Amino acid sequence: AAVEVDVSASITLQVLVDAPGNISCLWVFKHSSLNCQPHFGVVSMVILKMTETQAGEYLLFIQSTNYTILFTVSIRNTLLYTLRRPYFRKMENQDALVCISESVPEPIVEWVLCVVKKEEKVLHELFGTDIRCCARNELGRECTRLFTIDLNQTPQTTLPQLFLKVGEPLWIRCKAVHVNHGFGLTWELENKALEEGNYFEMSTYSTNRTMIRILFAFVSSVARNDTGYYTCSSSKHPSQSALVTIVEKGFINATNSSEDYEIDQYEEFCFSVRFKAYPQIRCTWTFSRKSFPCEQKGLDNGYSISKFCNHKHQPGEYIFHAENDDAQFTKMFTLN
Amino acid sequence: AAVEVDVSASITLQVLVDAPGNISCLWVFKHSSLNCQPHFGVVSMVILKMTETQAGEYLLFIQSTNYTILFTVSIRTLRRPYFRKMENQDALVCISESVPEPIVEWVLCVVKKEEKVLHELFGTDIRCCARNELGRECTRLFTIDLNQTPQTTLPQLFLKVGEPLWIRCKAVHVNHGFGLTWELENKALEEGNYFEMSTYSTNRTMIRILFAFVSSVARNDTGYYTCSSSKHPSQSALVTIVEKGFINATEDYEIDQYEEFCFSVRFKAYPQIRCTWTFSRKSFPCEQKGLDNGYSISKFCNHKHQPGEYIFHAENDDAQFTKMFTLN
Amino acid sequence: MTQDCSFQHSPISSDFAVKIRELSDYLLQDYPVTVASNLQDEELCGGLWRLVLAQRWMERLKTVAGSKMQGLLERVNTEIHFVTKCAFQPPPSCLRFVQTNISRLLQETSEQLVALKPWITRQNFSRCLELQCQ
Amino acid sequence: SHMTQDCSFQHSPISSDFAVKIRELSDYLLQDYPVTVASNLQDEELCGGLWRLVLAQRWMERLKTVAGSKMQGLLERVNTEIHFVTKCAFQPPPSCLRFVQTNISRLLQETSEQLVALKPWITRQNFSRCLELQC
Ligand SMILES: *[C@@H]1O[C@H](CO)[C@@H](O)[C@H](O)[C@H]1NC(C)=O
Ligand SMILES: *[C@@H]1O[C@H](CO)[C@@H](O)[C@H](O)[C@H]1NC(C)=O
Ligand SMILES: *[C@@H]1O[C@H](CO)[C@@H](O)[C@H](O)[C@H]1NC(C)=O
Ligand SMILES: *[C@@H]1O[C@H](CO)[C@@H](O)[C@H](O)[C@H]1NC(C)=O
């Protein structure tokens, strides 16, 4: 019901009710009347450059039933600080990828191919290694790693699981290295063919006349439809796969039990926490009010293991609080 | 090629050659023969609990080609780097001694170049590093940058009698029209104690290196050294030379578990000392940091309001020391 | 037969224009090379004939190139070496060559790769094996 | 960008690492690129190498104009090693001077050699009589 208009913006305002039939509307603007002609049922009022004049109380009365709607159009006098993780988009111009990271303040967008850093926001040398984009502002650094399937490389005996919220863009690069250029690559889903506007192929040469091929698959905006087991096969390589899980809300799965420990100031020890969580969580190790952040590193098994070592032989409660955009968590660690 | 076996260890020894094909091996153990059946090509000899008997000369002959491999299986010091200018050309060499033999890497700050022989001696922060099983001991090349801003406390350089003195004087100027000169006790330095290198930089800039060196120092060589350039200001550094390794340092205490305090020890010692803070048998090492005044000040804070004798024992290769700190 | 010429998978890389810009960055642009002056107009074999010739030039150049120029040549050579996968017949007596700048040869090579990229795997190039004069 | 006439150098304009900048240029060169060398330079053990360096220097400038963005840097860097010859008012080549086409690899090699032989004497000699090239 609450509308936030950022500057002289050009957007459309539509509302639909599950009953399309011979029904009539009437728009009731800021202390003035307005005529309408909608679609079957969905009604709309679109605006190009919303002036401080074109804002406020906007109602819409309907009759089959005799309904009434009301909207409060406000303006962006407020610009709240944030750090939304990087997204990807293939430049329409050529065979290259672009990093779309949102944040308040605006961040440093750097592509890192592992290590080598190249702050460009537009990456063209997409071939191999560990490719990850990183956003860095006043808040901090949030990174989105490009999901890779190396058919040339050894298999990860875990069958990778890829999670993402409905509407987010799916990105899976399949890289294969072969001696001669004579080999192809193909994408497939469990009992469903891959869309023509969901695939792209790049190729270059390596060392002594070697050929590397990148056959990446992408989804503009994901849905329940797009969730499933994806597989990449090469005409000179073994078919390696990964399953795509669509999520409604963010989650943190960690064996929370609040564990108790005890050691003598002569022993070398580090507190641990294994967790499978999405999106990448913001973690904090707090003790007797003194809070220190964490090296939230990945165990690659199918979870990330966060560690803490600066115990300083100090006894007491070491609490680990970790949280993402749509989920929270806290684990109590007693020490003697 | 050199194998280090720690106790009755259980490890595998495999070697692979980039050519997998119908090739045959033959293992040649310590003065005895042995049969093999490998993988396609990678060959191996694995051992569970390597006894003093199961160690020594172990060869492996192959045939497609007719190759032969040899391994020296052994069972379970680190003297800091020294410098020697290559007699062949205008380049420096790192002489670091150690048991086991170390990784000698030149680091120009940062950029690491493991070569043991450095030819690109121009500017930045040049330091050689030795790295073995024991650890990593580094010797930084003493530099005097006339081009750079001036530092305080007449750069005091300490070294033991017999050690090699190394002072590189770097000056950067617009045109090549400028010279460099070394002086000790306001005199013109020995002919076999100086060397000049030069190269170009950015917009036809010139960098000059006029380094001074002593093969083996004595009490004779100790003194105030100065480098002056014919387009730069004369910056200096004093050299302190001792017969053997030394430790020079300049107590009872009492406090209530409410006061924040740290024990201190100021010392001028060469070479860099290995220090240890021991109390009621429980020993903890120290942050042997430098005070830059003309001595290094070691500190200890984790008193834990615990009363008694806190003893500080510090020692180098040719000297020892201990100081007793009472607490109530 | 062994008198055929076709490619199942694309022997033309996406980043070939990069390797040519990199070679050109260390080249003396007016180095004299040659190009066929009277190649018959054949929109199927045309670029392929010139790539074969350009390819023959990358080899000649490698032999008189410095240690590091050899790498840049070889790397451009790899981008167009696939033409030797086919039994191309030696140039006919009618074929006239004209002296041109290596910058011209490199530029044309890039152009030929671009034009050939969408068709290299769809066409049968068996009749390109005999170079023809217009 | 300086002056000219009478010719001597107080401090060594020849670097120690000049052989490096030449090996680096040569690593990106097409070795038989045609350059020229004077064929009939009078034998003068004092001006000889200096005359050829002046000529080699004139070639580094001509080459920079037809060099690619990255080759320009390698040429310029070798040009700097021998640019000091322009600190002196060298007279234009005489009519008697004949030039012969040679490989740039030959020119680069000779330039290195001339710098080596000139390195111990560049600051001890008065090169005022070298300003006029002789046949
Ligand atoms: C799956 O994608 C197709 C093509 O875009 C679309 O028509 C269909 O609605 C999608 N399925 C769901 C359940 O959204
Ligand atoms: C986390 O564990 C809970 C246990 O009830 C389970 O319901 C949930 O599916 C798990 N989440 C994931 C992402 O596996
Ligand atoms: C974890 O378990 C402990 C012990 O029952 C409890 O105090 C704590 O609230 C739990 N934390 C979460 C995030 O569920
Ligand atoms: C010390 O050695 C130097 C070497 O250059 C020599 O000139 C000097 O006379 C020596 N001093 C004494 C007191 O022998």
mmCIF file with all atom_site columns, N, CA, C and O in Angstrom, chain B residues 220-253:
data_model
loop_
_atom_site.group_PDB
_atom_site.id
_atom_site.type_symbol
_atom_site.label_atom_id
_atom_site.label_alt_id
_atom_site.label_comp_id
_atom_site.label_asym_id
_atom_site.label_entity_id
_atom_site.label_seq_id
_atom_site.pdbx_PDB_ins_code
_atom_site.Cartn_x
_atom_site.Cartn_y
_atom_site.Cartn_z
_atom_site.occupancy
_atom_site.B_iso_or_equiv
_atom_site.pdbx_formal_charge
_atom_site.auth_seq_id
_atom_site.auth_comp_id
_atom_site.auth_asym_id
_atom_site.auth_atom_id
_atom_site.pdbx_PDB_model_num
ATOM 1   N N  . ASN B 1 220 ? 88.895 -1.990  13.478 1.00 0.00 ? 220 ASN B N  1
ATOM 2   C CA . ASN B 1 220 ? 89.474 -1.048  12.520 1.00 0.00 ? 220 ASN B CA 1
ATOM 3   C C  . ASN B 1 220 ? 88.423 -0.420  11.587 1.00 0.00 ? 220 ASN B C  1
ATOM 4   O O  . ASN B 1 220 ? 88.494 0.774   11.286 1.00 0.00 ? 220 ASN B O  1
ATOM 5   N N  . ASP B 1 221 ? 87.471 -1.238  11.124 1.00 0.00 ? 221 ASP B N  1
ATOM 6   C CA . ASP B 1 221 ? 86.418 -0.856  10.184 1.00 0.00 ? 221 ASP B CA 1
ATOM 7   C C  . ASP B 1 221 ? 85.212 -0.148  10.868 1.00 0.00 ? 221 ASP B C  1
ATOM 8   O O  . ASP B 1 221 ? 84.447 0.515   10.164 1.00 0.00 ? 221 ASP B O  1
ATOM 9   N N  . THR B 1 222 ? 85.045 -0.266  12.212 1.00 0.00 ? 222 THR B N  1
ATOM 10  C CA . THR B 1 222 ? 83.941 0.389   12.926 1.00 0.00 ? 222 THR B CA 1
ATOM 11  C C  . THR B 1 222 ? 84.103 1.903   12.779 1.00 0.00 ? 222 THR B C  1
ATOM 12  O O  . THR B 1 222 ? 85.230 2.406   12.824 1.00 0.00 ? 222 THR B O  1
ATOM 13  N N  . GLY B 1 223 ? 82.998 2.593   12.509 1.00 0.00 ? 223 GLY B N  1
ATOM 14  C CA . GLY B 1 223 ? 83.014 4.042   12.344 1.00 0.00 ? 223 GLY B CA 1
ATOM 15  C C  . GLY B 1 223 ? 81.806 4.644   11.659 1.00 0.00 ? 223 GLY B C  1
ATOM 16  O O  . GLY B 1 223 ? 80.946 3.919   11.157 1.00 0.00 ? 223 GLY B O  1
ATOM 17  N N  . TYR B 1 224 ? 81.761 5.988   11.611 1.00 0.00 ? 224 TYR B N  1
ATOM 18  C CA . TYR B 1 224 ? 80.674 6.730   10.990 1.00 0.00 ? 224 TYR B CA 1
ATOM 19  C C  . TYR B 1 224 ? 80.923 6.873   9.478  1.00 0.00 ? 224 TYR B C  1
ATOM 20  O O  . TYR B 1 224 ? 81.861 7.566   9.065  1.00 0.00 ? 224 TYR B O  1
ATOM 21  N N  . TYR B 1 225 ? 80.085 6.175   8.667  1.00 0.00 ? 225 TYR B N  1
ATOM 22  C CA . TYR B 1 225 ? 80.104 6.159   7.195  1.00 0.00 ? 225 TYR B CA 1
ATOM 23  C C  . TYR B 1 225 ? 79.082 7.139   6.634  1.00 0.00 ? 225 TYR B C  1
ATOM 24  O O  . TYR B 1 225 ? 77.965 7.229   7.140  1.00 0.00 ? 225 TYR B O  1
ATOM 25  N N  . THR B 1 226 ? 79.457 7.855   5.575  1.00 0.00 ? 226 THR B N  1
ATOM 26  C CA . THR B 1 226 ? 78.565 8.818   4.942  1.00 0.00 ? 226 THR B CA 1
ATOM 27  C C  . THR B 1 226 ? 78.635 8.721   3.420  1.00 0.00 ? 226 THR B C  1
ATOM 28  O O  . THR B 1 226 ? 79.716 8.542   2.841  1.00 0.00 ? 226 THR B O  1
ATOM 29  N N  . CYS B 1 227 ? 77.463 8.867   2.782  1.00 0.00 ? 227 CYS B N  1
ATOM 30  C CA . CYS B 1 227 ? 77.327 8.835   1.335  1.00 0.00 ? 227 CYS B CA 1
ATOM 31  C C  . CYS B 1 227 ? 76.842 10.188  0.837  1.00 0.00 ? 227 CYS B C  1
ATOM 32  O O  . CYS B 1 227 ? 75.803 10.678  1.302  1.00 0.00 ? 227 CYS B O  1
ATOM 33  N N  . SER B 1 228 ? 77.609 10.799  -0.084 1.00 0.00 ? 228 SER B N  1
ATOM 34  C CA . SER B 1 228 ? 77.276 12.109  -0.645 1.00 0.00 ? 228 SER B CA 1
ATOM 35  C C  . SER B 1 228 ? 77.182 12.042  -2.156 1.00 0.00 ? 228 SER B C  1
ATOM 36  O O  . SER B 1 228 ? 78.002 11.360  -2.773 1.00 0.00 ? 228 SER B O  1
ATOM 37  N N  . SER B 1 229 ? 76.196 12.745  -2.759 1.00 0.00 ? 229 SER B N  1
ATOM 38  C CA . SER B 1 229 ? 76.022 12.764  -4.214 1.00 0.00 ? 229 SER B CA 1
ATOM 39  C C  . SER B 1 229 ? 76.177 14.169  -4.806 1.00 0.00 ? 229 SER B C  1
ATOM 40  O O  . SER B 1 229 ? 75.727 15.150  -4.211 1.00 0.00 ? 229 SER B O  1
ATOM 41  N N  . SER B 1 230 ? 76.791 14.248  -6.006 1.00 0.00 ? 230 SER B N  1
ATOM 42  C CA . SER B 1 230 ? 77.046 15.482  -6.759 1.00 0.00 ? 230 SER B CA 1
ATOM 43  C C  . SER B 1 230 ? 75.743 16.050  -7.409 1.00 0.00 ? 230 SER B C  1
ATOM 44  O O  . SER B 1 230 ? 75.758 16.515  -8.557 1.00 0.00 ? 230 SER B O  1
ATOM 45  N N  . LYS B 1 231 ? 74.633 16.023  -6.637 1.00 0.00 ? 231 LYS B N  1
ATOM 46  C CA . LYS B 1 231 ? 73.281 16.510  -6.928 1.00 0.00 ? 231 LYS B CA 1
ATOM 47  C C  . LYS B 1 231 ? 72.327 16.060  -5.818 1.00 0.00 ? 231 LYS B C  1
ATOM 48  O O  . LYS B 1 231 ? 71.117 16.079  -6.031 1.00 0.00 ? 231 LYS B O  1
ATOM 49  N N  . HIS B 1 232 ? 72.862 15.650  -4.631 1.00 0.00 ? 232 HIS B N  1
ATOM 50  C CA . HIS B 1 232 ? 72.048 15.176  -3.495 1.00 0.00 ? 232 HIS B CA 1
ATOM 51  C C  . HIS B 1 232 ? 72.667 15.489  -2.084 1.00 0.00 ? 232 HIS B C  1
ATOM 52  O O  . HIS B 1 232 ? 73.867 15.770  -1.988 1.00 0.00 ? 232 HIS B O  1
ATOM 53  N N  . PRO B 1 233 ? 71.868 15.438  -0.979 1.00 0.00 ? 233 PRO B N  1
ATOM 54  C CA . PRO B 1 233 ? 72.439 15.724  0.352  1.00 0.00 ? 233 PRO B CA 1
ATOM 55  C C  . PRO B 1 233 ? 73.111 14.510  0.995  1.00 0.00 ? 233 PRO B C  1
ATOM 56  O O  . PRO B 1 233 ? 72.554 13.409  0.962  1.00 0.00 ? 233 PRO B O  1
ATOM 57  N N  . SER B 1 234 ? 74.288 14.731  1.623  1.00 0.00 ? 234 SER B N  1
ATOM 58  C CA . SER B 1 234 ? 75.112 13.695  2.271  1.00 0.00 ? 234 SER B CA 1
ATOM 59  C C  . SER B 1 234 ? 74.433 13.036  3.501  1.00 0.00 ? 234 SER B C  1
ATOM 60  O O  . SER B 1 234 ? 74.473 13.610  4.591  1.00 0.00 ? 234 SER B O  1
ATOM 61  N N  . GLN B 1 235 ? 73.840 11.819  3.330  1.00 0.00 ? 235 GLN B N  1
ATOM 62  C CA . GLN B 1 235 ? 73.202 11.086  4.443  1.00 0.00 ? 235 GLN B CA 1
ATOM 63  C C  . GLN B 1 235 ? 74.204 10.065  5.003  1.00 0.00 ? 235 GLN B C  1
ATOM 64  O O  . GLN B 1 235 ? 74.991 9.494   4.242  1.00 0.00 ? 235 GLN B O  1
ATOM 65  N N  . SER B 1 236 ? 74.216 9.874   6.333  1.00 0.00 ? 236 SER B N  1
ATOM 66  C CA . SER B 1 236 ? 75.198 9.001   6.983  1.00 0.00 ? 236 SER B CA 1
ATOM 67  C C  . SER B 1 236 ? 74.587 7.946   7.895  1.00 0.00 ? 236 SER B C  1
ATOM 68  O O  . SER B 1 236 ? 73.413 8.033   8.265  1.00 0.00 ? 236 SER B O  1
ATOM 69  N N  . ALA B 1 237 ? 75.424 6.966   8.280  1.00 0.00 ? 237 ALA B N  1
ATOM 70  C CA . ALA B 1 237 ? 75.107 5.831   9.149  1.00 0.00 ? 237 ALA B CA 1
ATOM 71  C C  . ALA B 1 237 ? 76.366 5.355   9.887  1.00 0.00 ? 237 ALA B C  1
ATOM 72  O O  . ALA B 1 237 ? 77.410 5.198   9.250  1.00 0.00 ? 237 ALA B O  1
ATOM 73  N N  . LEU B 1 238 ? 76.281 5.133   11.217 1.00 0.00 ? 238 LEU B N  1
ATOM 74  C CA . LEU B 1 238 ? 77.433 4.694   12.012 1.00 0.00 ? 238 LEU B CA 1
ATOM 75  C C  . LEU B 1 238 ? 77.455 3.188   12.160 1.00 0.00 ? 238 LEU B C  1
ATOM 76  O O  . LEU B 1 238 ? 76.423 2.567   12.384 1.00 0.00 ? 238 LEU B O  1
ATOM 77  N N  . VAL B 1 239 ? 78.648 2.616   12.054 1.00 0.00 ? 239 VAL B N  1
ATOM 78  C CA . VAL B 1 239 ? 78.884 1.183   12.116 1.00 0.00 ? 239 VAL B CA 1
ATOM 79  C C  . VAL B 1 239 ? 79.591 0.795   13.444 1.00 0.00 ? 239 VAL B C  1
ATOM 80  O O  . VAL B 1 239 ? 80.706 1.247   13.720 1.00 0.00 ? 239 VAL B O  1
ATOM 81  N N  . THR B 1 240 ? 78.910 -0.062  14.246 1.00 0.00 ? 240 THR B N  1
ATOM 82  C CA . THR B 1 240 ? 79.332 -0.615  15.540 1.00 0.00 ? 240 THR B CA 1
ATOM 83  C C  . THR B 1 240 ? 79.759 -2.082  15.340 1.00 0.00 ? 240 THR B C  1
ATOM 84  O O  . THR B 1 240 ? 78.901 -2.923  15.034 1.00 0.00 ? 240 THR B O  1
ATOM 85  N N  . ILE B 1 241 ? 81.100 -2.374  15.475 1.00 0.00 ? 241 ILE B N  1
ATOM 86  C CA . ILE B 1 241 ? 81.712 -3.713  15.271 1.00 0.00 ? 241 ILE B CA 1
ATOM 87  C C  . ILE B 1 241 ? 82.303 -4.334  16.566 1.00 0.00 ? 241 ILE B C  1
ATOM 88  O O  . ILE B 1 241 ? 83.292 -3.808  17.091 1.00 0.00 ? 241 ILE B O  1
ATOM 89  N N  . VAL B 1 242 ? 81.752 -5.520  17.005 1.00 0.00 ? 242 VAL B N  1
ATOM 90  C CA . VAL B 1 242 ? 82.149 -6.219  18.270 1.00 0.00 ? 242 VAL B CA 1
ATOM 91  C C  . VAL B 1 242 ? 82.937 -7.533  18.054 1.00 0.00 ? 242 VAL B C  1
ATOM 92  O O  . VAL B 1 242 ? 82.552 -8.335  17.213 1.00 0.00 ? 242 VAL B O  1
ATOM 93  N N  . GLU B 1 243 ? 83.968 -7.793  18.894 1.00 0.00 ? 243 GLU B N  1
ATOM 94  C CA . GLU B 1 243 ? 84.821 -8.991  18.839 1.00 0.00 ? 243 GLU B CA 1
ATOM 95  C C  . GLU B 1 243 ? 84.013 -10.294 18.714 1.00 0.00 ? 243 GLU B C  1
ATOM 96  O O  . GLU B 1 243 ? 84.354 -11.145 17.892 1.00 0.00 ? 243 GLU B O  1
ATOM 97  N N  . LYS B 1 244 ? 82.935 -10.424 19.504 1.00 0.00 ? 244 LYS B N  1
ATOM 98  C CA . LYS B 1 244 ? 82.035 -11.580 19.518 1.00 0.00 ? 244 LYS B CA 1
ATOM 99  C C  . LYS B 1 244 ? 80.608 -11.128 19.809 1.00 0.00 ? 244 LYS B C  1
ATOM 100 O O  . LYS B 1 244 ? 80.426 -9.987  20.238 1.00 0.00 ? 244 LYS B O  1
ATOM 101 N N  . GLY B 1 245 ? 79.624 -12.021 19.593 1.00 0.00 ? 245 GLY B N  1
ATOM 102 C CA . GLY B 1 245 ? 78.205 -11.763 19.853 1.00 0.00 ? 245 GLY B CA 1
ATOM 103 C C  . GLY B 1 245 ? 77.987 -11.205 21.247 1.00 0.00 ? 245 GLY B C  1
ATOM 104 O O  . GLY B 1 245 ? 78.636 -11.665 22.196 1.00 0.00 ? 245 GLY B O  1
ATOM 105 N N  . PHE B 1 246 ? 77.120 -10.165 21.377 1.00 0.00 ? 246 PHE B N  1
ATOM 106 C CA . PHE B 1 246 ? 76.913 -9.485  22.667 1.00 0.00 ? 246 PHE B CA 1
ATOM 107 C C  . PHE B 1 246 ? 75.454 -9.144  22.981 1.00 0.00 ? 246 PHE B C  1
ATOM 108 O O  . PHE B 1 246 ? 74.632 -8.984  22.072 1.00 0.00 ? 246 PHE B O  1
ATOM 109 N N  . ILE B 1 247 ? 75.170 -8.964  24.287 1.00 0.00 ? 247 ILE B N  1
ATOM 110 C CA . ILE B 1 247 ? 73.876 -8.552  24.840 1.00 0.00 ? 247 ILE B CA 1
ATOM 111 C C  . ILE B 1 247 ? 74.142 -7.517  25.935 1.00 0.00 ? 247 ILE B C  1
ATOM 112 O O  . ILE B 1 247 ? 74.764 -7.851  26.946 1.00 0.00 ? 247 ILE B O  1
ATOM 113 N N  . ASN B 1 248 ? 73.683 -6.271  25.739 1.00 0.00 ? 248 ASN B N  1
ATOM 114 C CA . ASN B 1 248 ? 73.826 -5.206  26.744 1.00 0.00 ? 248 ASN B CA 1
ATOM 115 C C  . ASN B 1 248 ? 72.432 -4.723  27.169 1.00 0.00 ? 248 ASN B C  1
ATOM 116 O O  . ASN B 1 248 ? 71.632 -4.402  26.296 1.00 0.00 ? 248 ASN B O  1
ATOM 117 N N  . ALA B 1 249 ? 72.118 -4.689  28.486 1.00 0.00 ? 249 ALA B N  1
ATOM 118 C CA . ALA B 1 249 ? 70.784 -4.271  28.946 1.00 0.00 ? 249 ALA B CA 1
ATOM 119 C C  . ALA B 1 249 ? 70.822 -3.499  30.269 1.00 0.00 ? 249 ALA B C  1
ATOM 120 O O  . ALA B 1 249 ? 71.559 -3.879  31.181 1.00 0.00 ? 249 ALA B O  1
ATOM 121 N N  . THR B 1 250 ? 69.991 -2.436  30.378 1.00 0.00 ? 250 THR B N  1
ATOM 122 C CA . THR B 1 250 ? 69.896 -1.583  31.566 1.00 0.00 ? 250 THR B CA 1
ATOM 123 C C  . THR B 1 250 ? 68.648 -1.907  32.383 1.00 0.00 ? 250 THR B C  1
ATOM 124 O O  . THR B 1 250 ? 67.527 -1.711  31.914 1.00 0.00 ? 250 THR B O  1
ATOM 125 N N  . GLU B 1 251 ? 65.041 -6.914  38.976 1.00 0.00 ? 251 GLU B N  1
ATOM 126 C CA . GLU B 1 251 ? 64.232 -5.861  39.585 1.00 0.00 ? 251 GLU B CA 1
ATOM 127 C C  . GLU B 1 251 ? 63.026 -6.446  40.334 1.00 0.00 ? 251 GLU B C  1
ATOM 128 O O  . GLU B 1 251 ? 62.482 -7.472  39.929 1.00 0.00 ? 251 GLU B O  1
ATOM 129 N N  . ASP B 1 252 ? 62.626 -5.804  41.440 1.00 0.00 ? 252 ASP B N  1
ATOM 130 C CA . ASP B 1 252 ? 61.490 -6.243  42.248 1.00 0.00 ? 252 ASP B CA 1
ATOM 131 C C  . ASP B 1 252 ? 60.292 -5.311  42.022 1.00 0.00 ? 252 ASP B C  1
ATOM 132 O O  . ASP B 1 252 ? 60.485 -4.109  41.839 1.00 0.00 ? 252 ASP B O  1
ATOM 133 N N  . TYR B 1 253 ? 59.062 -5.872  41.989 1.00 0.00 ? 253 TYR B N  1
ATOM 134 C CA . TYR B 1 253 ? 57.799 -5.154  41.747 1.00 0.00 ? 253 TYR B CA 1
ATOM 135 C C  . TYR B 1 253 ? 56.657 -5.662  42.645 1.00 0.00 ? 253 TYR B C  1
ATOM 136 O O  . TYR B 1 253 ? 56.760 -6.743  43.226 1.00 0.00 ? 253 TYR B O  1
#
